[PDB]
DNA sequence: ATCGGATGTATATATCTGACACGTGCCTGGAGACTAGGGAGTAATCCCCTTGGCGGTTAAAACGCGGGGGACAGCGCGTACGTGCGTTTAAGCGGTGCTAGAGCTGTCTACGACCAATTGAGCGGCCTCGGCACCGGGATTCTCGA
DNA sequence: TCGAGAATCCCGGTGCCGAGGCCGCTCAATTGGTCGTAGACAGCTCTAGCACCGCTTAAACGCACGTACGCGCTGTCCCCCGCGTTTTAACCGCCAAGGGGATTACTCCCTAGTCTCCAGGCACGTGTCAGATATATACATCCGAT
């Protein structure tokens, strides 16, 4: 009872759990990880975001709506080259 | 509303060339943003080529230019005789 | 006169009007030949028929009648060709071809 | 006997449907005989299918329990009785019902009694089956193990493993008397209910139903049984999509469509048409809906003790207060013409409903970390300066406090402060998993026991549970919905309490929270004078006008003060001032509210 | 004595039972969170549909699959099995995205 | 023949902020060659802008829009302000 | 009355007319408006100012009066915006900004 | 002895990319120690993207009518390839 | 004389530092002419396609020369190895 | 470690030579006035679809463990590459001889845009059953201590 | 060291739901007209190209010593893997509310388009200074012997 209420959250980084990373790994035909890489991955999966949902945001401001639509993705995806087929 | 598509043209296409299998709704969807890229790549190319040459129309030879250009080796070479033929036949009928 | 598109015209399958629209409206240029939409709906054609075959292909290989997103995928992949077209392209619900380095296999 | 019920229970013939004309006749005719009205749905799907066309063609020229029955341990009460008669009689004439009684009537023992009429008498120990939701099920064990002590009831829990080995053992063994299982375990255990012919289908709180096409409907449809026994103890609503579903359930013979039966009474060229058939609806419904109601059933208990506090807001609770108006002025004093958002109003009332209840909830209000527990947050709140006080006052005379708060933080400072103050507690809270919802709750409601107070929150708290040892039951606050604060108070108000229920309510005067009660009470209010006679002085048709414009006038009510600007609590003042304005509020509202209910009356006032 | 796969055994079952499926490898409500709060940056009070989300994800596995799939060259070309930090680092310098 | 190009507007920029600076042949050959580059990328952005919202007119709105996406960070935002004060500018006269 | 050009009535020094002018007989759009000359015109010189000025100061580091194509490569080159904004793009006669690896340093 | 009118000399072109040449590239990026077997598969990556590129500046010259490649073929068939060159025109 | 190495990070240092082609004129005209010579025969070049043609190349050069000189760090060494080529190429996306 | 030495490099100076920054005429395209028309701005509806919350089942995630195999450091050894000198060869420069290729200027006519009217290919909605996605039991195979 | 246990491929029956088929409203195809566009033409001037030849000069070629580094082997040790347990939160099924995405109508104003007019920018020609070059000096670094 002498545990106080602290009501830590986690990051939502956090949420791209250790083994996300080992399995997106084993699909990538990785045998043995270290354990230092789940930093990294959880770094760059960031950046990439961050870059796409930027410029999916500015087409949506464009538009005058608040609504970001898959077509506002995948103009924003094909715009670094990185074509996606299968939304429009 | 009015959305048109190729997925009536893909279907006739894939009857045509595997008379009894089918294809499912992702894989149709697929295929339409298929041929739209490659519409668009094709399209913008030969936009491209025409406003190089000072031209003002798109013609068969700017759209047979961008083939050479976009698709590779094997494919070029088919595709472009695909498209002779066909645009031969259209003309003499 | 009873009317004729220029599909039946042509000899194609994919529709010749709609093409001629969409280089018309897309400010592609200022004038389009008669000609670009027959050669570009035969050049669509082409290329639709032959990754369907080799996906049919891949379909019967394993055991299904209905072409999904993984069959397209490995069509593309294994054939050396096609993936040059769609090197940047990522195909929804594709997964990857199965390939695992020589040197990770036990002795 | 495992082999009069393997003979029995299992699906020995496969077919579809298989009457053609006696049960739907006789039903049909039972129904004409009982007020038939009915015609227009048998000549339509007469007329629309050949099956009852010819089924028509036909149609031209064609124990009463004076006791509480010896064998249920105990006795039943009187209407309790009644409905058992109900449920008897409704099964002599092959047709079902739907017992609606009110929330904590003990429509479960009514079930119980029923199916022990069943076995017992007319001797079917067929397969039964009782769907509910899972809270409710060691429930419903619990009572099959205590009225009519020799059931093979069994709960339908565990993992697959577990599962599939009562399936293959005792189900698919047919070595039970009847089955329990929630909405999720008859969902996914399909098939080894689907082969069984089931005598009957029972559903608590049926509501889950409502929907025609949920799949939980869907796969009800087809399991293959005779007489089916919903319950539903909310009253039902006033839309007819939901009750044609219920009754396509309970009877698919009559209720067999849809757009019929609304293009019958719902969809009318004037709406008189409908206004007048609400009476052939009541003639229809009677047969088949029994309800009964606490109010004109049982005194059985002391009515309520409703008290009422208006707390003052603390200094900090004033800083706070500011804090939060000076960030959020301009969305309410008036607006930028009524274009701030909707959700901007909200976020704000929640900001001010968060201060008002305590000033922790937002963070860098506690002093320096790290953190001592001590007094210093309970005179941080007069709220919980009054609890703390009330608290030590009820303890010491004796009682069992009950604490309903709306949200989880409020509880876990409650908590720590209550640790601070060395009395033993429970948290409820939705977070808690069952079988330890269950040692909790069986812990308290145990024999004598050093679990003195007993937290929960509302919504998370008024779901078939028996905690009525406790008798006063102050809540933390209020929420829009009068029914859930009801639910939570009779949480202790219900049979078998012996004393009196004592009801507190915890309300901040000069803010936000004080307009709540009223305008809770013009919610509350209004809704009774439906019950009865359907209409009454009750000019007050905006309800509020507007929201963006209600709660911008909620906000408002101390919005010039605070903006512009030990202390003991001394409790019975507070008692005295806080009841005579609370009986002159009742005063008021009682009049229709005729003065002003809202009256869309007010203006901006946090100018600057 | 219970029976213990030798180290390397199960890791070559996985990369076989993975790259012969289809499905997404992440969570899908942790990477939702992520999008919104990423958003929330850029504007406030945004509304995302359902096909953006799993655009997004489609995009950011098939990043991080084909990364992970250059972080194993570069590991084995140092003679080694094990990936590390640093090559990703070098896999990224490389592909032009530092 | 004449071809024009951005040969003096740049030379006017240079000796607005290096007063005392000059600029050789090549430089001004690739300064000239910078410029229609990000005119061409702006131009082609706010193109596909426009057709996407199915539009058929260009407008500052539309350039506004893509110098955002193209530029990174601080030149977009130092550019916008630039482009919004001109404009201002413009239409106060 | 007389006449003003569109740059001077916005204050710039980059030609509105021929951006206009190239707008329209360019293929992009329908209908060209009147701002976006102005703002395209405006967006331009911003750029080249800021490039201009970094290859002076190169150029002034190396104790020259003009600037060359190595200055132009090395204000690109060291300023992390213009790095990004021309990463695809190769610059004639630029060369190399000056970088060795500090493992190959000797001992 | 005679037969001399058979060319019989003149090494490959690709050879003209000397060693040298190879070992200045190699400095300028900025690498101390060099391999023997560089100079092979040195060549052999020049060789394929002058083929690429050439390939297409060559479509390019021939849609044209022309029979000569010009610097702008050659910038269009780079920008196609993904790698723009600034300075020759353009 | 000077210990190995030595010479090396001078000769890096002068290289990094000025602009000139480093591939000869002549070896690379005779290459490009001989290499367009399969798609079209009877071909003319102007001198400064040639020109943009080397500049382009040699960009090319460099670039591939420093992934190289990483991986072959990256490995625990200082000598570059047809092993790091094909790595960097295949990494790069062109193989 | 330190010190001299020998080489390579940075610094200051005079010389040139060729590209840059200037001015001049002129002609074309940018600006000023004006008209007519259609795109898009604004308002008002409508209902789709996002949000926001709840409770359950169960699979996935987290944790701690035991142990051996992979990473890393150290040693040795042979080889292959670097440094430097001498030798040879090819690039670069200049100069010859002629000719087509490619870029600038007018007249035709046939082909692509526009407008009217009209039907019929294609889109949408709605069904229905065959391919596919479960689920279980069986033989096959493959890994790993004895 | 082959037999034990765990994982895999295969067949058989089930259920379910998505693709393919069918029926009813609308723009590509038919005519007629007609105007720029872009093929054809001549003319005119600068580059490429294909056989040579002569010359200077630096760079490429080749070679011998040696050295330091690539590579293999050994040790060691600790980090990552497989695994079993416990906890948690994702997915799913669900319900309720309201923002806002998408559509329709009107009108008006801004853009296109024509005529007139004029001045800014472009080609042409031109004079001088910025920077490249070649020397000589100072001095900065590396290297080996002590
Ligand atoms: N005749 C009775 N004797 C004793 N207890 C009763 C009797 N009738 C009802 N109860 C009690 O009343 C409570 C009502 O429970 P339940 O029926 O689950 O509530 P609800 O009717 O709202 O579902 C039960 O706990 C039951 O023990
Ligand atoms: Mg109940």
């Known amino acids: 009872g002498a545990k106080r209420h602290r009501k830590v959250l986690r990051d939502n980084i956090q949420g791209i759990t250790k083994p996300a990373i080992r399995r997106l790994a084993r699909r990538g035909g990785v045998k043995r990880i270290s354990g230092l890489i789940y930093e990294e991955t959880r770094g760059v999966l960031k950046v990439f975001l961050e870059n796409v949902i930027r410029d999916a945001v500015t087409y949506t401001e464009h538009a005058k709506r608040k609504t970001v639509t898959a077509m506002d993705v995948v103009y924003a995806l094909k715009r670094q080259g990185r074509t996606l087929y299968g939304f429009g | ?93 | 006169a009873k009317a004729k598109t220029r599909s039946s015209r042509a000899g194609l399958q994919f529709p010749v009007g709609r093409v001629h629209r969409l280089l018309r409206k897309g400010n592609y240029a200022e004038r389009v030949g008669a000609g670009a939409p027959v050669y570009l709906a035969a050049v669509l054609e082409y290329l639709t028929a032959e990754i369907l075959e080799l996906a049919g292909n891949a379909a019967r290989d394993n055991k299904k009648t209905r072409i999904i997103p993984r069959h397209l995928q490995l069509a593309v992949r294994n054939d050396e060709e096609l993936n040059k077209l769609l090197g940047r392209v990522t195909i929804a619900q594709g997964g990857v071809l199965p390939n695992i380095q020589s040197v990770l296999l036990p002795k | 006997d495992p082999e009069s019920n393997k003979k029995r229970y299992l699906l020995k013939d496969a077919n579809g449907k298989k009457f053609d004309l006696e049960g739907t006749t006789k039903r049909f005719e039972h129904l004409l005989s009982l007020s038939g009205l009915f015609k227009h749905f048998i000549e339509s799907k007469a007329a629309k299918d050949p099956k009852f066309r010819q089924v028509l063609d036909v149609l031209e020229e064609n124990f009463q329990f004076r006791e509480s029955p010896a064998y249920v341990n105990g006795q039943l009460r009187p209407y309790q009785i009644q409905g058992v008669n109900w449920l008897v009689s409704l099964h002599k004439n092959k047709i079902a019902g739907i017992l609606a009684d009110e929330m904590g009537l003990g429509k479960t023992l009514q079930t119980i009694s029923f199916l022990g009429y069943l076995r017992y008498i007319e001797k079917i120990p067929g397969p039964f089956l009782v769907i509910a939701p899972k809270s409710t099920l060691n429930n419903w064990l619990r009572e099959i193990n205590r009225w009519t002590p020799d059931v093979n009831a069994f709960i339908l829990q565990g993992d697959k493993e577990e599962r599939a080995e009562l399936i293959q053992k005792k189900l698919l063994g047919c070595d039970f008397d009847v089955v329990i299982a929630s909405y999720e375990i008859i969902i996914r255990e399909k098939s080894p209910l689907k082969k069984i012919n089931w005598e009957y289908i029972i559903i608590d709180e049926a509501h889950r139903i409502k929907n025609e096409e949920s799949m939980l409907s869907q796969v009800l449809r087809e399991f293959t049984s005779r007489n089916r026994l919903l319950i539903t103890g909310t009253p039902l609503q006033n839309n007819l999509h939901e009750l044609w579903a219920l009754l396509n359930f309970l009877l698919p013979d009559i209720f067999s469509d849809a757009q019929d039966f609304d293009d019958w009474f719902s969809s009318e060229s004037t709406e008189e048409d409908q206004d007048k058939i609400v009476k052939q609806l009541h003639t229809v419904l009677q047969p088949f809906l029994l309800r009964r109601i606490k109010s004109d059933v049982e005194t059985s208990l002391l009515p309520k003790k409703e008290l009422n506090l208006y707390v003052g807001m603390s200094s900090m609770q004033k800083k706070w207060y500011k804090k939060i108006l000076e960030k959020d002025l301009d969305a309410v004093n008036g607006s930028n013409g009524s274009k701030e958002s909707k959700t901007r109003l909200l976020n704000i009332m929640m900001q001010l409903r968060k201060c008002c209840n305590h000033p922790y909830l937002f963070d860098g209000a506690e002093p320096g970390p790290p953190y001592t527990t001590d007094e210093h947050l309970v005179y941080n709140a007069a709220k919980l300066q009054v609890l703390d006080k009330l608290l030590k006052k009820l303890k010491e005379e004796g009682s069992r406090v009950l604490i309903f708060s709306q949200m989880s933080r409020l509880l876990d400072i409650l908590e720590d402060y209550c640790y601070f103050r060395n009395y033993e507690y429970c948290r409820i809270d939705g977070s808690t998993a069952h079988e330890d919802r269950i040692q909790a709750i069986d812990d308290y409601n145990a024999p004598d026991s050093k679990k003195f107070v007993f937290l929960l929150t509302t919504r998370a708290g008024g779901l078939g549970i028996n905690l009525t040892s406790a008798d006063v039951v102050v809540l933390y606050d209020s929420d829009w919905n009068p029914q859930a604060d009801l639910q939570a108070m009779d949480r202790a108000h219900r049979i078998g309490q012996k004393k009196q229920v004592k009801v507190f309510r915890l309300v901040t005067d000069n803010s936000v929270e004080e307009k709540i009660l009223e305008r809770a009470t013009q919610k509350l209010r209004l809704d009774q004078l439906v019950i009865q006679q359907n209409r009454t002085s009750l000019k007050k048709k905006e309800n509020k006008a507007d929201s963006k414009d209600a709660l911008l006038s909620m906000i408002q009510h101390g919005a010039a003060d605070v903006f512009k600007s030990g202390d003991d609590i001394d409790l019975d003042e507070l008692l005295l001032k806080s009841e005579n304005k609370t009986k002159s509020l009742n005063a008021k509202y009682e009049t229709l509210g005729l003065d002003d209910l809202q009256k869309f009356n007010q203006d901006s006032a946090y100018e600057w | 004595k219970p029976h213990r796969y030798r180290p390397g055994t199960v890791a070559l079952r996985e990369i076989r039972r993975y790259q012969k499926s289809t499905e997404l490898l992440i969570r899908k409500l942790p990477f939702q969170r992520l999008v919104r709060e990423i958003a929330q940056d850029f504007k406030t009070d945004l509304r995302f549909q359902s096909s953006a989300v799993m655009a997004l994800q489609e995009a950011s596995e098939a990043y991080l699959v084909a990364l992970f799939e250059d972080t194993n060259l570069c590991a084995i070309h140092a003679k080694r099995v094990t990936i590390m930090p640093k090559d990703i680092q070098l896999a990224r310098r490389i592909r032009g995205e530092r």
Not at chain 2, 42 to 54: D, M, W
Not at chain 2, 58 to 71: D, K
């Open chain 2, 1 to 93: 509303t009015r959305k048109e598509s190729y997925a009536i043209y893909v279907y006739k296409v894939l009857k045509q060339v595997h008379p009894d299998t089918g294809i499912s709704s992702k894989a149709m969807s697929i295929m339409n943003s298929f041929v739209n890229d490659v519409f668009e790549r094709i399209a913008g190319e030969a936009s491209r080529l025409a406003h190089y040459n000072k031209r003002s129309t798109i013609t068969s030879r700017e759209i047979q230019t961008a083939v050479r250009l976009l698709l590779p080796g094997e494919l070029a070479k088919h595709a472009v005789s695909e498209g002779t033929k066909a645009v031969t036949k259209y003309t003499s009928a």
